Amino acid sequence: NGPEIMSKLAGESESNLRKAFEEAEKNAPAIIFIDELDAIAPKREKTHGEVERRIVSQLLTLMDGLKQRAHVIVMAATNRPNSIDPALRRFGRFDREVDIGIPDATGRLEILQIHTKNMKLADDVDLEQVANETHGHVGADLAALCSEAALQAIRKKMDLIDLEDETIDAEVMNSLAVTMDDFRWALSQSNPSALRETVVEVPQVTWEDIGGLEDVKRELQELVQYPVEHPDKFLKFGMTPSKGVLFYGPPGCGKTLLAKAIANECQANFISIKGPELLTMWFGESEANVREIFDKARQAAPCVLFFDELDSIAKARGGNIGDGGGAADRVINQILTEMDGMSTKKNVFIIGATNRPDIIDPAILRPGRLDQLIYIPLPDEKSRVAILKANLRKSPVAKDVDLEFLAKMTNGFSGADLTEICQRACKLAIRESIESEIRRERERQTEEDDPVPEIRRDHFEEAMRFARRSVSDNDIRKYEMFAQTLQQSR
Amino acid sequence: KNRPNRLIVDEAINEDNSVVSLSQPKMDELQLFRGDTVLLKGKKRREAVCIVLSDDECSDEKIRMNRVVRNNLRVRLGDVISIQPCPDVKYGKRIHVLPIDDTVEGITGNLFEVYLKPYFLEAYRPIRKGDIFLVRGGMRAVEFKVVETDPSPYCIVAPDTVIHCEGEPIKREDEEESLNEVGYDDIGGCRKQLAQIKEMVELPLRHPALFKAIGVKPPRGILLYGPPGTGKTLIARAVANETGAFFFLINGPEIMSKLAGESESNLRKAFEEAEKNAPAIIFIDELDAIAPKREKTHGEVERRIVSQLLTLMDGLKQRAHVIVMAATNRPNSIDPALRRFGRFDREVDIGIPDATGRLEILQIHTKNMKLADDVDLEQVANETHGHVGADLAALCSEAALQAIRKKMDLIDLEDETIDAEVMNSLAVTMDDFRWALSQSNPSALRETVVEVPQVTWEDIGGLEDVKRELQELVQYPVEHPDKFLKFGMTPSKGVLFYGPPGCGKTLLAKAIANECQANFISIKGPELLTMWFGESEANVREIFDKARQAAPCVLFFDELDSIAKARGGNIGDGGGAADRVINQILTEMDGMSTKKNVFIIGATNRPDIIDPAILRPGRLDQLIYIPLPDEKSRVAILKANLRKSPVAKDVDLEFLAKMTNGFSGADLTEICQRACKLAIRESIESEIRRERERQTEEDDPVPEIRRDHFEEAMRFARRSVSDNDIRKYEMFAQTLQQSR
Numbered sequence A: 001n002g003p004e005i006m007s008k009l010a011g012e013s014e015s016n017l018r019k020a021f022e023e024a025e026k027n028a029p030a031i032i033f034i035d036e037l038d039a040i041a042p043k044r045e046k047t048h049g050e051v052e053r054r055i056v057s058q059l060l061t062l063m064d065g066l067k068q069r070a071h072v073i074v075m076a077a078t079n080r081p082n083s084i085d086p087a088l089r090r091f092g093r094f095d096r097e098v099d100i101g102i103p104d105a106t107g108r109l110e111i112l113q114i115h116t117k118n119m120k121l122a123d124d125v126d127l128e129q130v131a132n133e134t135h136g137h138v139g140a141d142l143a144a145l146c147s148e149a150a151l152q153a154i155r156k157k158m159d160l161i162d163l164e165d166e167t168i169d170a171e172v173m174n175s176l177a178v179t180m181d182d183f184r185w186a187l188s189q190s191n192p193s194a195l196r197e198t199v200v201e202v203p204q205v206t207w208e209d210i211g212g213l214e215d216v217k218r219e220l221q222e223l224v225q226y227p228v229e230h231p232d233k234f235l236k237f238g239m240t241p242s243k244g245v246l247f248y249g250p251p252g253c254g255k256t257l258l259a260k261a262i263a264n265e266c267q268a269n270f271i272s273i274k275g276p277e278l279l280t281m282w283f284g285e286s287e288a289n290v291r292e293i294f295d296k297a298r299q300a301a302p303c304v305l306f307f308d309e310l311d312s313i314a315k316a317r318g319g320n321i322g323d324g325g326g327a328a329d330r331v332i333n334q335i336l337t338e339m340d341g342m343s344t345k346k347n348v349f350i351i352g353a354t355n356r357p358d359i360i361d362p363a364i365l366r367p368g369r370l371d372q373l374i375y376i377p378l379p380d381e382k383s384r385v386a387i388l389k390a391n392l393r394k395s396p397v398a399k400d401v402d403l404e405f406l407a408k409m410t411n412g413f414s415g416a417d418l419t420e421i422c423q424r425a426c427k428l429a430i431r432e433s434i435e436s437e438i439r440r441e442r443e444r445q446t447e448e449d450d451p452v453p454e455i456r457r458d459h460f461e462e463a464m465r466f467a468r469r470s471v472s473d474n475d476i477r478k479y480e481m482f483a484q485t486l487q488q489s490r
Numbered sequence B: 001k002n003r004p005n006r007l008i009v010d011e012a013i014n015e016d017n018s019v020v021s022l023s024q025p026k027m028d029e030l031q032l033f034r035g036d037t038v039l040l041k042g043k044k045r046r047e048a049v050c051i052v053l054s055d056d057e058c059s060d061e062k063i064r065m066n067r068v069v070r071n072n073l074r075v076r077l078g079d080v081i082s083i084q085p086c087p088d089v090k091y092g093k094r095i096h097v098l099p100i101d102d103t104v105e106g107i108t109g110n111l112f113e114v115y116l117k118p119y120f121l122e123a124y125r126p127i128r129k130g131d132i133f134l135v136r137g138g139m140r141a142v143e144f145k146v147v148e149t150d151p152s153p154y155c156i157v158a159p160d161t162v163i164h165c166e167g168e169p170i171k172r173e174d175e176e177e178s179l180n181e182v183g184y185d186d187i188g189g190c191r192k193q194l195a196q197i198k199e200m201v202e203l204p205l206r207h208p209a210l211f212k213a214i215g216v217k218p219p220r221g222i223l224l225y226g227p228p229g230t231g232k233t234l235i236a237r238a239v240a241n242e243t244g245a246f247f248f249l250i251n252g253p254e255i256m257s258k259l260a261g262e263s264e265s266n267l268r269k270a271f272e273e274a275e276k277n278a279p280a281i282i283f284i285d286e287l288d289a290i291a292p293k294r295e296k297t298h299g300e301v302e303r304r305i306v307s308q309l310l311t312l313m314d315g316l317k318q319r320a321h322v323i324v325m326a327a328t329n330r331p332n333s334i335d336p337a338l339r340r341f342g343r344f345d346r347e348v349d350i351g352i353p354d355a356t357g358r359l360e361i362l363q364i365h366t367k368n369m370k371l372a373d374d375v376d377l378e379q380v381a382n383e384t385h386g387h388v389g390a391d392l393a394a395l396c397s398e399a400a401l402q403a404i405r406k407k408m409d410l411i412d413l414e415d416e417t418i419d420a421e422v423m424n425s426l427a428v429t430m431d432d433f434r435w436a437l438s439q440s441n442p443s444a445l446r447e448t449v450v451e452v453p454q455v456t457w458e459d460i461g462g463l464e465d466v467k468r469e470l471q472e473l474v475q476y477p478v479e480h481p482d483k484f485l486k487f488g489m490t491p492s493k494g495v496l497f498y499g500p501p502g503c504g505k506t507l508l509a510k511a512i513a514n515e516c517q518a519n520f521i522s523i524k525g526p527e528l529l530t531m532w533f534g535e536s537e538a539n540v541r542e543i544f545d546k547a548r549q550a551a552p553c554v555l556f557f558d559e560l561d562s563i564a565k566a567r568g569g570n571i572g573d574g575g576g577a578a579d580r581v582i583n584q585i586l587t588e589m590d591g592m593s594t595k596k597n598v599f600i601i602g603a604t605n606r607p608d609i610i611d612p613a614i615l616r617p618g619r620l621d622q623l624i625y626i627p628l629p630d631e632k633s634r635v636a637i638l639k640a641n642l643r644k645s646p647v648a649k650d651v652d653l654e655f656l657a658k659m660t661n662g663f664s665g666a667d668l669t670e671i672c673q674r675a676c677k678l679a680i681r682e683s684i685e686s687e688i689r690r691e692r693e694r695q696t697e698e699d700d701p702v703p704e705i706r707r708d709h710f711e712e713a714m715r716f717a718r719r720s721v722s723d724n725d726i727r728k729y730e731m732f733a734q735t736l737q738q739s740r
């Protein structure tokens, strides 16, 4: 243990390290676990005083020595890899690096099943809902959540209720069924999720979650799949596989959807880097974090690194005229540097996105970088129907409502407006439900089943009243001009 | 007996110290009456006699009991008791009671005359052998133990019955914990965090063998924090005394003063001592002195002690029910290696008290000070914005000292020595408190206040549809989550009020935060500007952290366009609408919990220059336009403003609302304040003129703010918004809602 060794007196700690390595050498095969390595051997800048560096040196010497005829593997744990002494990650000492990382939805459900193994859950307990509501929790958080729900079940009843009659017994322990409400309480307030890092996972979006855009689907499948599933054709024909796409078009039409979808179909991780993050690196003047981002994409290969709102910096300092300078920024330049300097084929596929393609740094559209310009257009009727169906398929909707009529009337609506319509109609329906509930609670003359909850017609007739177009015709004209000029001029 | 006659004890709310209050049902069900006396049998064959009352709030299985009688039964909080009816009033004849030497020392005075005379005056108090009661007065709280009762072994004193107070004070027993010790009754303004702490340390301490018999994770580390002198150590000792668990106290500077190697011996031996006397509670006071951040540590001697503390925390969590509660000023000021799981996993934010809490604190500290009659602690508690418990305690002590200092010390300095008589006769006037609060106490804190605002829905005139929309958006996602889950809709987490300045945006925020009884955090313009100029936007994180620590909450950013117009207005700076701070607002708002009951509200009187990347779904997306009032609303505004001030009856507010057209809601308050100024001037001038009466002292003329005072206050009326701004808001609405 890191702090355990670091608590002992000067010279006692090195005796402990030496004797520990001796003990493990004597009982081979062995595994040494140096927990909290960043407490024993931090970076040279954070070391001061002989006593620290001497112990770091002793650890280095022991690591270098063990690799003579001694099958002792040394596994060490640390919070962040770039927080420990870089002299340790040189070969012969710590050459293999494993990134555990926070769990995802299926993993969290599995964690819950592991910790509720002998807790005698109730019947209404649906751990799917819980695992879906625990974004940010690691194994310790979920373990504490399950224990806290158990304690709440012991606390409400079956302790104070049998406090006065009869002593403790196994009977009450068997009869304890921890309700779904109990888990809802334990997850409700009494546990602060202990992490807010960049999540890496295989997104649960699928190809049928997106309406329209079929040719864009086949192009995405071609560009992402063919270089990994048929490398021999690429080697035979000498072509080099591209490592980038740039979606562009009106905002709210499915760029992020397409990214998540193609990252899911190939079962490869997905790292989203939204606008505010690039702006945070520009304002804070720390563009040297871009490196770290790409490092993650290397640690979780195969991946899909997705920079959306790539024009954010470009329009933060004014738009078309804007700042007097050129299109070179502090962050986008690091993106160029890191993208030119990645591995030959590490199965990492950078995707960009921008709803203003005219102000993007044109030095990123050059070969060897993001060079496949795909234009995500505004939907059509045969696509708007699919958009409405894919959005509404989670909500219970009536059968007399015609979505084709909606798609007929909602012309030029970006894909987000067709979601605002559905959310607003759902709001109206929920309001009607709760109001009817209260009116049926005014029944004090006699408790009965709530009326039919199908989102009905003439609810959309009101939600449609407040419909907005989130893109002017002028922006459509701008995208048209971009396409016409850059593809057809000469 | 295994049939229902046993009850669960809990806290009390009544100021009487010799009664028990039970719910109206359990009263009829136990075959008892209101007021009927009973026997309360508890543990170790020690029962008592008490009086019963009725209280709707307390539940059936629960019984209000104050600390004195609760301690009398030898039982502690959370245990079970047996109540038996006894209408056998064996009316007393003479009592033999003597004080304790520990509580009675230095107290020159005939104790019979000074304490027990109004105590037992027309008091039908039942007494039984083995009861140590107490009575308060003369800046003291005195304990009396009854040895010898004429009706054996219990009685009830009648107003006629004598009380016989001969003898010397007796030394205290080994099995009553004295009542100068701290209990939950003392802690005034932290009745909500006390719920969390009690539910956390109830089962491990009260029921220790249960966790031996169950595989489940107990809470081990609790980190209390909050500004100094808020009551952390108080809460620790209170919990220790109520649960009866052994309490070891480790002081930060005390350990850090010892020599290198002596301090670690002290920590190790302290943990050993607490382990030996389990159940226990270790209180490491001033943790930020022992284990600060790694950047502020330098030198082996520091880090070594931090490491020793880490190792002890990690070690204790093997088969050892010792909870470790540590206190610190600010949570991000201590070593982050401590707040990782297994060491300090529970975090509690005590925080500064609010108005009701401060009034309760005052009542706690004026418990035995014999206040005057004019003392209205409501006014005091309303004037102590910024004070923590230590400040109010010092305020009460200083007012007491001022009362001793003016008179009753120098006046009886030359005739007669000290006595209890003067201590009883000391009534601390309201002026005395006004003096002590006036200058002689610097309120010791200026942090962001978190509280449930006292504004209500009738404090706001007009805006009814905005009220129903606010109620819908804030209430429906918490009170009916099943509808939202059934229909698949996601609940929005933001609103953006916009409109002319001074029309009720902050009022609406406070009102909807009050109706839901959720905390309110105001973040005004100057704060965002301070984070922009100082180039420290990394404080925005901290703000949201507070909103998480005090959930449910309403985080309110008003004047959200402040940064946007600080660097020039419409044209302004050449850059775009992206700022250093608003970007952090976006980052933190996208990255909060799925549903943590925190509802961000924005406000801006210039909606055209706000960063349009904040109006996107998943952020503040409900645009509500607070318009300029109308006549049927201006009447309500004027009434809601004037209802605190005494105004005449012939004044017509409808005429004012008729004449004041297009007046923003602030101008209708400036009118009232200016009229009040005129009235106060007239009052003081008339007072001086009546003081020029030197010919003869009489009652001040009628103080109703009268008509023809508004006729002057109305003379200087201003419109704080041009028609051009109204036109701008109209254009914003027209374009953004109707264009296509």
Ligand SMILES: Nc1ncnc2c1ncn2[C@@H]1O[C@H](COP(=O)(O)OP(=O)(O)O)[C@@H](O)[C@H]1O
Pocket (backbone or CB within 6 Å): A209, A210, A211, A212, A250, A251, A252, A253, A254, A255, A256, A257, A258, A308, A379, A386, A387, A390, A391, A414, A415, A416, A419
């Ligand atoms: N073609 C589409 N098919 C299905 N849903 C869509 C489509 N276009 C937009 N949406 C909806 O719009 C919302 C936001 O779209 P998003 O992909 O984030 O916009 P952008 O492409 O600008 O990133 C998504 O929740 C999605 O449900």
Ligand SMILES: Nc1ncnc2c1ncn2[C@@H]1O[C@H](COP(=O)(O)OP(=O)(O)O)[C@@H](O)[C@H]1O
Pocket (backbone or CB within 6 Å): B186, B187, B188, B189, B190, B227, B228, B229, B230, B231, B232, B233, B234, B235, B361, B364, B388, B389, B390, B391, B393
């Ligand atoms: N919440 C409170 N309730 C009652 N008294 C308090 C409270 N807070 C402070 N006081 C008074 O001020 C004193 C300071 O309490 P203390 O626990 O020493 O503060 P801290 O440990 O936070 O520095 C208490 O002993 C009490 O006299």
Ligand SMILES: Nc1ncnc2c1ncn2[C@@H]1O[C@H](COP(=O)(O)OP(=O)(O)O)[C@@H](O)[C@H]1O
Pocket (backbone or CB within 6 Å): B459, B460, B461, B462, B500, B501, B502, B503, B504, B505, B506, B507, B508, B558, B629, B636, B637, B640, B641, B664, B665, B666, B669
């Ligand atoms: N509709 C209203 N009803 C009651 N009082 C109002 C109203 N509008 C404004 N006021 C008064 O105006 C003062 C300042 O209003 P405030 O809400 O701070 O302005 P803003 O809405 O610009 O924040 C408050 O003290 C309040 O008494």
